[model samples]
Target chain A: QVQLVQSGAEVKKPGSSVKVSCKASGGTFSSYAISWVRQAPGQGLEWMGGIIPIFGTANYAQKFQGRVTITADESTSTAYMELSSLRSEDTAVYYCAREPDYYDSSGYYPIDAFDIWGQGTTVTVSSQSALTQPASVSASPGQSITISCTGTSSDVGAYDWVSWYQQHPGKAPKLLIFDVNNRPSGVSHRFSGSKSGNTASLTISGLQAEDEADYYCASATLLDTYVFGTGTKVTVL
Target chain B: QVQLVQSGAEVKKPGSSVKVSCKASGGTFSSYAISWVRQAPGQGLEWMGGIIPIFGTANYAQKFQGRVTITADESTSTAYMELSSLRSEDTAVYYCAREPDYYDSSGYYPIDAFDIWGQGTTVTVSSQSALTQPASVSASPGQSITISCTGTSSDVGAYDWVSWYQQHPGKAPKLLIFDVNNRPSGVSHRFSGSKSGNTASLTISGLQAEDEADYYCASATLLDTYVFGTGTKVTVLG
Candidate 1:
């Protein structure tokens, strides 16, 4: 009979902060742990962090470590996640879940991965025109093509943490390059990546007919902010 | 005051099963969860799994999932990890740690990352000579060279999950390539990887003076078994 009822959604201005509330109900308020998760419009689940309501301790993943804070009030059995320095790429739906405890012959113990979750709260950050890429480029098969994702000193110049993705129609986005200049496993070797100050580029030396698609360049800040560039179309003429 | 005292070291034959016992002490039998971690001769820490005595629940990493079984006996405060189908790559020292619970104003709660661990138990699964590599390879700087790791159909052919490591004297190992032919982040683009039926390879197209070092090729089975090959030295050939 456990229930998790969270707050409504809202839109935040660029370079601002946002907060969401989650209420724990169904009787045992502080009996279990509470956790938060996020998902972009088309992307998959991203684990934010979790807190044990009883001990009042918090644990965060490496990427989300210092950017967001999770706290709870035992009296009202509610949780809050306050995120700072929001950006366009931070636009997504956030949800909360309960980490329950079980009892056996010995005593009480806790286990993670709950089966229930709150409805979810949505937030969309407006575009800032952070990245630049051409609208379309045409190249013949067997020829070479280059797609670029250029950012400011806060992102690509800060670290080689650039990434590239490929998407077509209703298909899911595929990660071609990650960590700025590294190709992911099972990707075509004909593709390569390189970066300089404030600019990251992906090169496809020997293009094939299958390589014609839509591409996007993305990068992130060290403090939990992300920015994706404009869409570029590839026409194999 | 929680501590872990695990069983002693032991050696196992090829393709056999082995078990280790970890006895929890410090007067908190079922108060905290118990977990296991392992370290090979020169490798870093690898998390195996954890089991909660009170709830009798066990959680394991994807790589260790089903290859090893973890169980606990609350009466004597002991935990057991029984690993089957051991291989030479399984040679390592395994340690046990305690998952303690902390108390705040609200009530009792649980948290991982214990501060205490057992001495450790070592186990070596004798070599089966499953991987074949040249004892030493010599090549000149600025020249192209290819290193091969040939294994039987049971490994390389089963899946192309081959990996390559680079090392130097008095230095820790670094992963240059993983998943058969995928170069890791920050690795030089000059080094490329490829694989055929039962043979995987790493080719240095433009070798530099800095590339003069030792290289090792490795592969793993779908189970928890991992195998690294012999060493190959790169001579600059002045």
Candidate 2:
């Protein structure tokens, strides 16, 4: 019964700062570590940093090591994340997630991932403008599985361009379909992306064991720059 | 404050079966997925399988797909593991670990890892089989890192026949040294292994980003067929 309730949306000027709070309820605050993820308008998700409340320790992605601050208050059962020196390009949807950890005699160590997550909070850095990726799908080997991404008229509907990314845990994401309806060299032909109105679809004709991973669909929108969907986890039954 | 309390020790006969239970309390059981790990007498750790109790979905290592059964009872907040056709070689300590996951509108999906682990339950097979074994270490580039493995008088102390293995996140473990104080022909010269008494030491003189991995040491025991050290993780500091 662990739930992560996050703060409301925010609007800030360029070079300003915005502090977002993720309140943990239904469980102990220090038991699980918290991680943050960011997704630009149509870009894929980016891991920002993580904080372990009990130890008062935090680690950030190399790019955001000092630029972003992630901290949690065990007393209040709340985790706070503050992004400073924001810019128009920094505008994105942020989320607070539970980081799984391994308990040792010494202490709990974090695993490199985001498990349960808050819905997400939108942060608009105006001084301009600013984006659930989905659940799991189980398909038997050799079966066909198709998942879609929904976007605004300006993105998937406005243009014929759409992209897809596949992540097999412990490795970086690989481009399955660069743009709409096409595969990169060396990629299998079983996977294809198609578009219809404001929705984009990706179908795997002959799914195999190697197809196991978290599959994500990304397409651009006019409101922001690129936009991303909540991802879909594909399991080969 | 979540904990996985496992069942007690057991003494089973060859061809018999043993069931170990991992009860999850202190938090939501359905919210987390449970995984299992195996460690032989002197052998290293091995990933057996994982099960998401909430959905009743389970997966296992290719080698143990049909051999091992991992199940969970969300109603009872407990996960169960049963190994059948037990043999002398099956005598080892088994652990249940928590597998992290990301949430979706439908359900929780597991990450391929064993983050939090149970205290562990020792299972002994009368058929007669046969045996933390480090955390990560961070060092700057060009800095040398040394890892050591200790064994009983019959192992490291009895013979200089020790070996080392290196493995990155997804890559299979590779042999770096065949015996104490010697390197395989193709391995980097920076890698070397040595032994003093019952302890075997491995030193990487010129550490690099590519060299960052989990290092393991194994020795041949006079009685026990083989013994391995708990591994040490090495990372290159930015």
Candidate 3:
């Protein structure tokens, strides 16, 4: 019953700054930690870092050290991360994920993977402010799932690798694959994928419905940046 | 410097099964454990499991237990995971990550988060069988960044809570987040997360790119499940 409500869309010019928010519900907000991610138009996913609401301590992607800042208002069950020096490259979709609390003093909470998620916000880097509907998908295990997103710009075709990720409705999105067809070692072969003539395909055999949820794909490049396709919704169908 | 050079692409039919390989290089392969991850088109990532290349002892995501198998050839310095019932959904970009080896007083090998990674191998599952380019993200603390795959079919859109992790190329992707916006209590605040709209964000704020290599976002659902955003590649953007 965990729910994540994110902030609205935003538009900022180069060298400017922006702050986004994620509000929590269905559980004790103070107990868990929140994470933030950035996705550029036609670019792959990258980690910005995360924050512990109770301590006000934050971690950056090492790459985002001084470029970004993370903060939260526990009284209102809300968390925030700020990115500065907004360049054209900084223009992408941003997200917030939760780090679950552990049962014992093991210090190792499940930290296993993201369990809930919030709809993403598209941040456009332009002089004018614009807002778009954030799209999402849902899936279980063995059903067919697909999501397609047409980038605002056609420059997306220059990439070679297209990939996908799995998010459990209300959790953070986890890394599934890159270049669309490769499975990182230790990943189950049950999670399959492919891409042909621009459209990428990710098919999870054995359909676990619990595996049922949303799927996303990205056009990847050797430069290290990636572009994401709009996410697809997977029903038990 | 430890690196992982993975096998090339693999293609299979709907019912036909396939086993992919991840080979470790640059260091002693058996000294550390190797883990695997699955990335589908536009969706988030899923943690399939982990394996010790030396001893072949494997761990799997509770959901992937029976359906997936992990094996390794100590002599060949390679590890393998096979999927018996191959379906279309089973196709994805699989990567081999090398877990940093932490030894205890007893000389036991304990698996830690992957600090290195391999060039990934692309596997296609279709009615036709063919192999293609093996795609992989170079994982350095902050070299470059990527989270591939964004979905097109719209239902609900949100980042829920984007999470991040460290992995050695050709190994297992570790857990950096859970619930939605909370770290696992004892995790260093250096690993932080947050969410906005339909995009989950994991910013290693002061990025070395190499420090946050191979990062991903994940979300939790009402049904006690998890989903991952197509992973983000971490490159030297700074």
Candidate 4:
């Protein structure tokens, strides 16, 4: 209902190592604070950092500091990101965002971004280790899909805005687009964005994968906190 | 060492509307203040609102206010944002960012989230009317671009942090992310963000035509200074 349920479908080999999971349903996964982003198939979108379930504390995005690693359990609200050596450019497709409570870092309620998401899972890096059994496709309404997320540390403060949202596979998600670095005027520059203090990115060039094909990235919100997990499913190729 | 020289290539029709230009070079464009971004051909990245080009004053991202309109002159340093009624989904490619001197109105900066960028200008809304050469693509290294700056409203400060940038067509732009909205732990939750008052945003999700390139948005000042504009190139097969 509030959603952000991820974890599953990852094939690794090149160097070997992978861990992904994002489970938060309907709301209150420790009050919120979970972020991770990465997108590397065609390229564009990366900000591997974020995690604060209740004082576990974490941050990254200095090119993903040492490669990447973020953790959380909050009992089972769930949140984990682990990448250690896999290559193929990391293959791509990762997500888990939600940092939207509205503030509280001695500054008292001001950070707010990341609208809502979850329903993405796909990690394919190869040297050759196959199990293959995770493929779902459905895009229509402007078509074009690609999703990813990763995190470990770069110390990005928490958040305010780094966004994208659109779901049409089963329906229930729609913002068509949200805060692309700070967007919302006349809209349609083809949609573009980028960042590197913690890696915040977005690009929507041309394809027609179907438009509402499910895609996410929502970070921004310091203290009140929030987090999201589960994103990656844009199979048009 | 910062630049965001934009403005070139525009063809509007559909509902009709266009205002494009982001000019700044080498450094000092009013001391930083300018942000406006959008990309929607393949799909991903949106946050259309921001302008502090030295007090021209602007802020919209409630979904982009009335369809976008940001302005700034600062005597000629130049900065203007206008997008209204144009349809075709609006055509894609529009950026202007620069805010990293340690950034501060009250928040953002001390992050380095929009390194540096510019060399993008391509806007096509087509129904015909005038878009003569419509093909100009270059920005690869990881692809995704955006940069903007135009200030002087006495240094409009509400808590600036309108930042976002990425380049991967010709390559040379990187800062994968910045904070104002926060994303830097693993940076892969598909990317998401939001902010209000002064305006700030960054978003990316399940979208890879390569992620289909080009984007920028910047705003951050504590005095070190920064202001950019002059980027927007994303045309992957069309």
Candidate 5:
């Protein structure tokens, strides 16, 4: 049995740095690659980067290249993610997930989906402050529900910098809106998004039974990573 | 854009057989590999096996090598998994996930993440003969302990492909051993695996306090998905 136990939550001021750890147990820790994920309050999962602990090789999301650092200590079977110059926008729950293995003939291992996850570590960047959103909202069929995500920092107001994700119970999240207003192909037009003045909003019209799920807003700042809104559960009443 | 639409739900009898399909659309399916995963009710997720359609090549999680057969059709951009001699314990939702792009000397292909996923196919094998086992084991640190996973002949003895996984409560299963004895990079050599007839065993030598968790064995046939064994629990004696 393999287990990944993460460090506890943290509270930091803006411009401070924080490093969280995930301890691996019950199996060979270095054999598997570990990836970092971020979930602001109630938002969807974000892929940060990954590292093969044994070789100390790391890969980061293009946006996180310079701001996020991933390192591991094989001796202690622990992996760490250090976020520097934190701001209120950096407040979120961070997770360490073990990457699944692929059968490779060329000896080149491609990192895939996360199979094992660490209990999340919460990081609160106090100086900047996080975005605020409703916990839950309800609307009748054919009615429209607009949920707003308001941030305290100017970075949140950037044009086309906000995105939206939808998650049904017991399933992985799906990307609905990216770059503020662009819906991915196949997503119903009934769902739309917009941003203005440090606030982002996702609206669902003609609400259907299937539309009842958790909706999260994510905003990208000048910083490398994106900040997620706490989350709003939209119920079609 | 890549999409994997899986087959619908299925209900089967004990000692029966069933096959499921995942049809790919919206992309060059042949350029990517499809991996199958399992999720039991209220459980996290499990990686079963994978197949590359163009080359008709397949890789099992060792345990799934014989019990499940993974096949792909380039013409249809579809992948299939067939399970044989099913038992009630086989009930679960199965998903087909696409692998991230691989890098070669040529350049970086634009693929990362299991970004695309199948809605999931559910399988229910109903019978009293459902696989079951001793729920837990006790061992002392530095001692050797062996866990056994017993299965039917149609699946277990059918192949040498078997993989072991370790899972903690509320967390996803992690690959401990794939392709029988092959451990992943950075994995310790303390773990070993073997198969004898219809039974597969995983032994951990020099067990430490951290060696406590749920252990599972998955067997593969020449087909699309791997048949997983009922899990076993390992407890290091305090």
Candidate 6:
């Protein structure tokens, strides 16, 4: 009955610092490794490094290295992540996962996949109110539908930095449109993304049955990782 | 630009067998490793095992050692998985994924995280065979414990290439031991594995309180896929 309980939501300003905690219970916390995963409002999961409490060692994803810090407290059975110099791009839901352990004559450490997950802690890093439009939408074939996403003054600037992702139930999210309007090679052309002023929208034309899934809009900044919209469930009626 | 194009869906009866194929393209096939992943209906992902196409070497999750076989052909750039003595519980969508490759002075090999995936092959095993029975064990800390998995001739009794896995609730299963006795790097010293005539056992010595979890054994053959054992739940009594 391994359990990872994360801390509560937080609201901070740009340039501030935020620390999130994940407390382990019902098992020996040092026996397994803990990894931090990021899922921006409606975006997909990103691996952010992990820490082994017993050894006091850590490993970070290439993009997160030097930008975030991972630490653990063996006595308290708790792991912490500190994101400094926060921007709107750092605002997202962060989750902690328990990496399964394998031990031999040499030593004990975590393996690749995560077996148990913490609920999640949401962090908001903006002074202005974050805005999202059309929590849910329905459309028929050949019709065009758009869902908008807006952020604070510091987050939304360049229109080309917006990206969109599609996620089906029980599966990982897939990149649909990147760099505002460019679809990946295998993706359908019916989906498009664009930004005007401080908001960005994803438009789906000629909707089909396969288009019924949760859609998320993301904004990328030059200084940090991506920040995502709250999410929109699009149904093909 | 690596691609894994998998075989089509399959429908089989209980006690039957089926083999699935994954064809690789757009890259040097021999330079990477391919692993099979399973998703049972609405369930989450489960890692079955992996194979090195160039060497035809295979690794199995302990639960599928005898019931599944992983094989590869470098000439054809293809990998295969064969499941034997199937049951209704075996019905699932199996995906073949290419592990990202990294090369150095040691030549090319695979690392964690599958970057490319094949469209899944759905397998439907209808009816039911004499299903394997699950096991429950209660052991005290600082003691030694062994759990055995026995399977029929078409699955377990046929091979010594077996592996093991540990799964917690609501999440994916993790590989515990692979290729019988060889533990992956970073594994603890407390766990060990062995096999005899038709049974495979996982022994945990000086068991700690954290050793409690669901344990599954699997056997692998030359065919490619694996057959998993009915899981065992070990309760480390305080």
Q: Write the per-residue lDDT of candidate 2 for residues B73-98, one digit (tens) a residue.
A: 87788899989888755555577867
Error of 2 at A70 (Å): 15
Cα deviation of A84 in candidate 2 (Å)?
26
Instruction: Write one digit per residue (lDDT tens) for candidate 4, span A1-237.
Output: 456777755656668889988888775445477777654422334557877777677887556668888888877788888989875456545667666554555653523444454544445554200011111234444554333333213212233344555545322243334443555455466666555555454555565645435455544334322233224335444
Per-model TM values vs. the true structure:
0.29, 0.31, 0.39, 0.27, 0.33, 0.32
Candidate 1: clashing pairs of residues:
none
TM-score of 4: 0.27
Q: Where does candidate 2 stray beyond 4 Å? A: A1-237, B1-137
Query: How would you encode candidate 3's per-residue C-alpha lDDT over A18-102 as one tens digit per residue?
Result: 9998888887445467777765432334557777766677766557889989898878888887889886456555777675546
How does each model score on lDDT?
A: 0.66, 0.66, 0.55, 0.51, 0.67, 0.67
Clashes of each: 0, 17, 269, 172, 27, 32
lDDT tens digits by residue: candidate 5, A1-237: 677888865767679999999888897435567888775421246668888865668878776789999998887888899999886446555778776454456776543335567756656554223356665678898999999888745446755667777766433346677777877678898989887778889989888988987776766566534566656667687
Off by over 4 Å in 1: A103-108, A128-237, B1-238
The lDDT ranking, best first, is 5, 6, 1, 2, 3, 4
lDDT of 1 by residue, B1-238 (tens): 5567777656577589989998877774345577776654323345677787777677876767889898988878888888888874566557676655556679766542334567566665542233555434556777998988887776766786777767553233456777777775688888888999988888888778888766777665444344556445555566
Question: CAPRI band of model 1?
Answer: incorrect
Tens digits of per-residue lDDT, candidate 6, A41-133, equal 212356677887767788776667888899988778889999888865565557787766677799864333455667666565542122354
lDDT (Cα, 0-100) at A100 in candidate 2: 53
The candidate maximizing TM-score is 3
Show model 6 residue runs off by greater than 4 Å.
A1-237, B1-31, B39-133, B222-224
